[PDB]
Amino acid sequence: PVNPCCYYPCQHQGICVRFGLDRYQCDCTRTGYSGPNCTIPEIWTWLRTTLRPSPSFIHFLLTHGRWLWDFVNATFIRDTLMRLVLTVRSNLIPSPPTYNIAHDYISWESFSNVSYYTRILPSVPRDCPTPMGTKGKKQLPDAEFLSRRFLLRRKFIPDPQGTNLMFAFFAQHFTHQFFKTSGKMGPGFTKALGHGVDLGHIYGDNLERQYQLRLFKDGKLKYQMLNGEVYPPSVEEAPVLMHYPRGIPPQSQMAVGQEVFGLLPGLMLYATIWLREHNRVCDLLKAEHPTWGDEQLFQTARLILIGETIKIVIEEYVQQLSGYFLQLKFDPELLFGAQFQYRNRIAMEFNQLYHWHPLMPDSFRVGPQDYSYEQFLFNTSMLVDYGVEALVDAFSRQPAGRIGGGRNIDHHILHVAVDVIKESRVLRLQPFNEYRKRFGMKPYTSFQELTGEKEMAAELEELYGDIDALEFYPGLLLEKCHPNSIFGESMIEMGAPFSLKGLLGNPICSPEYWKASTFGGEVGFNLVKTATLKKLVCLNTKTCPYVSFHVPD
Amino acid sequence: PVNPCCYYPCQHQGICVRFGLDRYQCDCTRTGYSGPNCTIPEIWTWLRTTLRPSPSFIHFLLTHGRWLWDFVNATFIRDTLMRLVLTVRSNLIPSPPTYNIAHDYISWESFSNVSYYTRILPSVPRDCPTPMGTKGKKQLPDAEFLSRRFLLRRKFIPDPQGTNLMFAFFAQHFTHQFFKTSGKMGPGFTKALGHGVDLGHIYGDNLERQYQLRLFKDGKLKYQMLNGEVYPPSVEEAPVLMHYPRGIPPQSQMAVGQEVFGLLPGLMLYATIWLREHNRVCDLLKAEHPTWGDEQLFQTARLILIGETIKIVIEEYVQQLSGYFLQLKFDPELLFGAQFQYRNRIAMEFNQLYHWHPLMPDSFRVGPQDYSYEQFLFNTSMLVDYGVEALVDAFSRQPAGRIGGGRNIDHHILHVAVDVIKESRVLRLQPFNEYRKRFGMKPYTSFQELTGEKEMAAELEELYGDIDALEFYPGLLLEKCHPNSIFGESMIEMGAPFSLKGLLGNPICSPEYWKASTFGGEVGFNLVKTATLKKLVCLNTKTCPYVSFHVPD
Numbered sequence A, B: 001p002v003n004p005c006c007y008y009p010c011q012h013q014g015i016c017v018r019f020g021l022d023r024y025q026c027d028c029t030r031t032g033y034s035g036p037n038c039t040i041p042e043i044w045t046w047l048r049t050t051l052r053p054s055p056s057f058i059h060f061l062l063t064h065g066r067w068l069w070d071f072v073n074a075t076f077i078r079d080t081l082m083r084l085v086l087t088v089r090s091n092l093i094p095s096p097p098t099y100n101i102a103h104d105y106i107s108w109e110s111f112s113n114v115s116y117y118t119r120i121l122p123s124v125p126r127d128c129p130t131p132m133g134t135k136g137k138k139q140l141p142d143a144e145f146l147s148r149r150f151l152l153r154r155k156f157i158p159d160p161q162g163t164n165l166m167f168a169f170f171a172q173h174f175t176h177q178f179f180k181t182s183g184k185m186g187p188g189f190t191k192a193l194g195h196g197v198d199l200g201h202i203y204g205d206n207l208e209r210q211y212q213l214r215l216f217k218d219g220k221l222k223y224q225m226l227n228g229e230v231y232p233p234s235v236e237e238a239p240v241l242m243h244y245p246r247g248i249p250p251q252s253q254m255a256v257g258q259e260v261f262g263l264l265p266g267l268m269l270y271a272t273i274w275l276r277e278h279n280r281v282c283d284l285l286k287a288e289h290p291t292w293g294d295e296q297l298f299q300t301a302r303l304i305l306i307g308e309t310i311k312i313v314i315e316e317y318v319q320q321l322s323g324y325f326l327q328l329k330f331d332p333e334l335l336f337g338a339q340f341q342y343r344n345r346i347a348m349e350f351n352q353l354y355h356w357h358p359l360m361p362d363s364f365r366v367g368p369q370d371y372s373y374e375q376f377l378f379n380t381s382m383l384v385d386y387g388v389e390a391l392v393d394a395f396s397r398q399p400a401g402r403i404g405g406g407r408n409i410d411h412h413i414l415h416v417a418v419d420v421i422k423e424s425r426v427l428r429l430q431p432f433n434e435y436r437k438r439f440g441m442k443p444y445t446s447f448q449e450l451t452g453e454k455e456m457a458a459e460l461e462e463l464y465g466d467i468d469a470l471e472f473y474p475g476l477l478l479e480k481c482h483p484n485s486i487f488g489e490s491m492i493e494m495g496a497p498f499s500l501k502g503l504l505g506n507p508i509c510s511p512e513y514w515k516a517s518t519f520g521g522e523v524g525f526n527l528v529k530t531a532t533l534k535k536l537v538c539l540n541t542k543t544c545p546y547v548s549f550h551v552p553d
């Protein structure tokens, strides 16, 4: 007989378990539903469904009416809604984590082995009639053809929200601490064992690397003085594994936490900033505690930087991304009266979701100059040539592309998106519509409804066959955006649960850790509480340039 | 200059932080106290501490008045009290974890590096006057002499609670899955990376060792047949590292999850029983799931055995140990309306505390025979000679030694108690009375108050000089026992928070995991819900012997 779990019969987070030769069962425990497929609502669930307004309506509320949002932000209601946003989003994410690439069920190996990426939905069973489950054709559309006809940028479509490259290089820098897909272990495995905001892109994913980057004096990391400016040390000074083109002199090579950060001047930009901040923090701690050893000066500074990161990510990064009129607030105290797990494991779907390559432009403007991909990529001198001030100013001024909408990835880095779809099929991700149902959305009934247009939608119908066969990453990028927004509903409704759970899931946000002593008295605590992007750059640079996640207009 | 944090100035879980040259500050955050030293109580704390009865009063209520308890056990008050027991006890344990041997302060390294045991109180700073802080003598009492004069058994004292050897072997077996101090890394480090009831003493501490034990057919572990009965295989069959005496060849050995288990027949007994159980569980699962592969059968059986372990420990093991009239209950659902982190880090203090070597008798009786320590230790054939049925009957009939009170450790295994004291001084553990205040108890004002008698008290007062200089492990064993109890209050009041946090902190007790599907349906879920020590033995044997955690009348 055929595998019945290929039909995804279990609704609203119910678990499909195969019993006997030809039967199956759904485990509807705490799903809010009863019945063989978990489609029969309990009194409380029915009372919530016909009173829950559509995700588009709630977006509309958050993006309109400046007058009432000014009132809300200046009252207690700011905290109420921030607590509401945090809980409701994160409660979609299983914690402790549930499945992985090896196991489409709960196991001890899935809990303990942190080298795995986790998954919210199980993979499409290996014995299903069609690659995506039961719907569609026996062979999925060509990955290269799909990227060429639907993802390749014709003309540059700029982001309507005013997102800049300063955001884009932050987005890449920040995420590369919890996205480190293994080379030797293959797909579904991660080198980033911290599984979140651990700053292993600054300190490293292991102790051997960390010790090698540390100066072991005053808690600082090693550095070099070039033209009177502070930069990460050379590989000769800090002998760590760094990915560079075979030939580049070791004098030009810079040693940082993440191995791929020397490839782009934008990545090595922030790496330099955070390094300068770390030592600046250490100087504030050594004054406060002159009896403190190097190790305490180091570890305490790290936690401050971790706190600063989450502060800026929530209140500035996610703020610009969402375009919400609600002034987002980083306050761990909000979740102290609630049932919240202070742990996090990175999901593969989040890894797939965060591929925001449409952000990258056609070229890179630095003042009167205009640098192409073949001038900007692997360039080692640029960062030192222009300096931190001059580059931050240029990245904060240049607009980034629109993520959603489709056909917005520059031809250079299109190969990446091709791999993402190929990787998706190795991982055996479920269809787009099943992830829609998992995140409390209605599945798309037609290809028309996904893209919101006639032409590109009708072409996909011919290639996929059935809408319930549309793939995870294509669906996300092909979906119509919100009125004047950077992407569609799915990117918000699916990404936020992963995102906010990752931020507030950090142990520093727990009642046990969120104390003044953790950060070395009140000084270190205020450093977290009052951190800003503007403060992160200018308190570490000679002059103060234009710095923001949005273009100046 | 003298370090102010040596004076332990911050009371009620206040964190001492060294500011400037010789100044200190207490971090009185969410402790319920304010002021310079966290002694000024908040409105609710004052109310809460004046109304709170002594631990000795609560002990009395739980151990007296059968008529009241028969009523309580038959009503929902059973569930009401057990939830209070669970939540109130385990809240005394910091989670996420706090300190280790490296850091006497909150750090990311302490959080992420699972090789470390955690600790509740920080160490005694190295720049203090006396090794125990400020109080006591410059040179601490001799570890060898201290165990000789106070801990050495003269005449055997049986436990008045009726605890048998079956309990003591379960205790040692059960504990060695989360107590595995890395002899090569040093004290404070652990090989048991699951940090709790992960069954790393049945399936090994690492992945490669697990696979060597696994038969890879029907989810079962490898096994050899002797006398028609099921036993763990040899190292020839399953090539894994086993700590055997020099000269004993691998073919004469038996392969299990814990390396040290070959050294004692009692440890090797339970290893056999749980292995028999796993394969027995696999048989039931295979009938219900013929489509299931090997991996899922093994992983699911493991979870079922984890659930079985926690059930028996709570409802029988802790029941016997406590001797409470309240019928204890394992139901994770009691915590589903509570703030509870489902994670556990094994403490170094919990290690020190669990060295229950007094339990071991003068000799070992197996029916008509009486084996000495030399005859019993490192024995290879005894298990195979008698069988499981016979030795279960044997250990369940012979009384185990009373833990507390003092002077009840056999000379053969007395060298352990010595090493524990010497390990504590390496670990720079805080005084006994400092842990008393840490676990809601009054510090002892004298040694006479600690012991109840007068002779031992006088010489301890001579050797230590001060009661506040007394060490953790000597203090736990020499303390007066509750009338007709196995040990004193400090073993309960300090040990209960660790063990209950360890048991319920297991991810299977979370709302996400605690589902029937996790255990392959209702069949596996019931096995967990109806687990017994009796059922663990007599469902894996041909005949059922006397099996209990206590002796017969």
Ligand SMILES: *[C@@H]1O[C@H](CO)[C@@H](O[C@@H]2O[C@H](CO)[C@@H](O[C@@H]3O[C@H](CO)[C@@H](O[C@@H]4O[C@H](CO)[C@@H](O[C@H]5O[C@H](CO)[C@@H](O)[C@H](O)[C@@H]5O)[C@H](O)[C@@H]4O)[C@H](O)[C@@H]3O)[C@H](O)[C@H]2NC(C)=O)[C@H](O)[C@H]1NC(C)=O
Residues within 6 Å of the ligand: A206, A207, A208, A211, A239, B102, B113, B114, B115, B116, B184, B185, B186
């Ligand atoms: C959890 O925490 C444990 C720490 O308690 C971790 O175990 C420890 O791991 C460290 C490093 O991995 C081991 O190193 C020891 O620390 C000494 C510090 O002084 C160290 O001396 C220095 O070693 C440097 C290398 O790390 C060395 O620099 C040289 O590096 C290269 C050669 O390695 C070359 O490029 C050059 O020769 C450099 O000079 C420097 O010169 C010093 O000699 C020494 O190596 C020590 O061995 C610890 O042994 C170890 N502690 C233990 C086992 O107790 C553990 O890994 C953590 N767990 C996880 C999962 O991360």
Ligand code: HEM
Residues within 6 Å of the ligand: A168, A169, A171, A172, A173, A175, A176, A179, A180, A181, A182, A264, A351, A354, A355, A356, A357, A359, A360, A413, A416, A419
């Ligand atoms: C033009 C600059 C960029 C280059 C050259 C680049 C390069 C790459 C490549 C080649 C991969 C896949 C590795 C493979 O071949 O298998 C990758 C992965 C990834 N990309 Fe980019 N990328 C760029 C921009 C960005 C930006 C701006 C973001 C925004 C967050 C981003 C997000 C990611 C993420 C999250 C991954 C997964 C990390 C991992 O490999 O584990 N990329 N990048």
Ligand code: HEM
Residues within 6 Å of the ligand: B168, B169, B171, B172, B173, B175, B176, B179, B180, B181, B264, B351, B354, B355, B356, B357, B359, B360, B413, B416, B419
């Ligand atoms: C006659 C049987 C026993 C023998 C021969 C014995 C001896 C030993 C030895 C040699 C060790 C390893 C070295 C050490 O840590 O001291 C050890 C560890 C330990 N034992 Fe026992 N003991 C016995 C009974 C018990 C009992 C009844 C308990 C109660 C649970 C117990 C609990 C422990 C604990 C908690 C450890 C520490 C584990 C570690 O960190 O390695 N032992 N014992």
Ligand SMILES: *[C@@H]1O[C@H](CO)[C@@H](O[C@@H]2O[C@H](CO)[C@@H](O)[C@H](O)[C@H]2NC(C)=O)[C@H](O)[C@H]1NC(C)=O
Residues within 6 Å of the ligand: A374, A375, A376, A379, A380, A381, A382, A383, A385, A386
């Ligand atoms: C890397 O980038 C640097 C920018 O600092 C490049 O140097 C500039 O190159 C342009 C031509 O593209 C010249 O017109 C400028 O005069 C150069 N500026 C400076 C300050 O030297 C450099 O060519 C790039 N390197 C590589 C290998 O592509």
Ligand SMILES: *[C@@H]1O[C@H](CO)[C@@H](O[C@H]2O[C@H](CO)[C@@H](O)[C@H](O)[C@H]2NC(C)=O)[C@H](O)[C@H]1NC(C)=O
Residues within 6 Å of the ligand: A004, A007, A009, A036, A037, A039
């Ligand atoms: C539960 O989900 C299954 C998905 O397979 C539904 O399908 C079943 O019922 C259909 C209509 O009666 C039949 O045509 C299918 O053959 C049958 N599928 C199987 C595997 O037996 C089923 O209707 C759903 N049940 C309810 C109550 O809605």
Ligand SMILES: *[C@H]1O[C@H](CO)[C@@H](O[C@@H]2O[C@H](CO)[C@@H](O)[C@H](O)[C@H]2NC(C)=O)[C@H](O)[C@H]1NC(C)=O
Residues within 6 Å of the ligand: A113, A115, A116, A184, A185, A186, B206, B207, B208, B211
């Ligand atoms: C957890 O992740 C994987 C599980 O597949 C482990 O890697 C495998 O280990 C086994 C036994 O050692 C090998 O046979 C496989 O070849 C390995 N697969 C790989 C490397 O892809 C890994 O060892 C585990 N990690 C930890 C920390 O337990």
Ligand SMILES: CCCCCCCCO[C@@H]1O[C@H](CO)[C@@H](O)[C@H](O)[C@H]1O
Residues within 6 Å of the ligand: A049, A050, A051, A052, A053, A054, A057
């Ligand atoms: C622009 C098209 C008009 C449709 C009005 C949608 C506004 C959403 O209104 C929603 O109505 C639902 C009832 O259907 C309720 O359950 C929601 O709580 C309510 O807000």
Ligand SMILES: CCCCCCCCO[C@@H]1O[C@H](CO)[C@@H](O)[C@H](O)[C@H]1O
Residues within 6 Å of the ligand: A054, A055, A058, A061, A081, A084, A085, A088, A089, A092, A439, A440, A493, A497
């Ligand atoms: C004015 C009130 C709107 C602000 C409250 C935001 C509620 C949190 O956002 C909610 O996230 C859930 C989890 O993904 C989704 O299922 C909901 O549709 C979404 O609105």
Ligand SMILES: CCCCCCCCO[C@@H]1O[C@H](CO)[C@@H](O)[C@H](O)[C@H]1O
Residues within 6 Å of the ligand: B054, B055, B056, B058, B061, B062, B081, B084, B085, B088, B089, B092, B439, B440, B493, B497
């Ligand atoms: C009728 C007796 C049952 C009362 C339920 C109390 C169980 C909580 O246990 C309590 O833990 C406290 C914190 O660890 C200790 O200080 C108390 O002495 C202990 O009884």
Ligand SMILES: CCCCCCCCO[C@@H]1O[C@H](CO)[C@@H](O)[C@H](O)[C@H]1O
Residues within 6 Å of the ligand: B053, B054, B056, B057, B060
């Ligand atoms: C209402 C609780 C306040 C009394 C706590 C006093 C501490 C006395 O302690 C307890 O007193 C009990 C009195 O019944 C005795 O039976 C116990 O053995 C004794 O330890």
Ligand SMILES: C[C@H](C(=O)O)c1ccc(-c2ccccc2)c(F)c1
Residues within 6 Å of the ligand: A085, A089, A318, A321, A322, A328, A491, A492, A494, A495, A496, A497, A499, A500
């Ligand atoms: C606060 C707001 C909300 O939860 O709706 C929100 C939170 C997080 C994201 C977000 C989505 C994907 C990657 C990174 C962040 C997002 F797009 C919107």
Ligand SMILES: C[C@H](C(=O)O)c1ccc(-c2ccccc2)c(F)c1
Residues within 6 Å of the ligand: B085, B089, B318, B321, B322, B491, B492, B494, B495, B496, B497, B499, B500
């Ligand atoms: C239920 C009871 C209580 O909390 O008081 C209780 C719970 C756990 C222990 C216990 C103490 C030390 C090691 C193992 C178990 C104990 F001794 C008593």
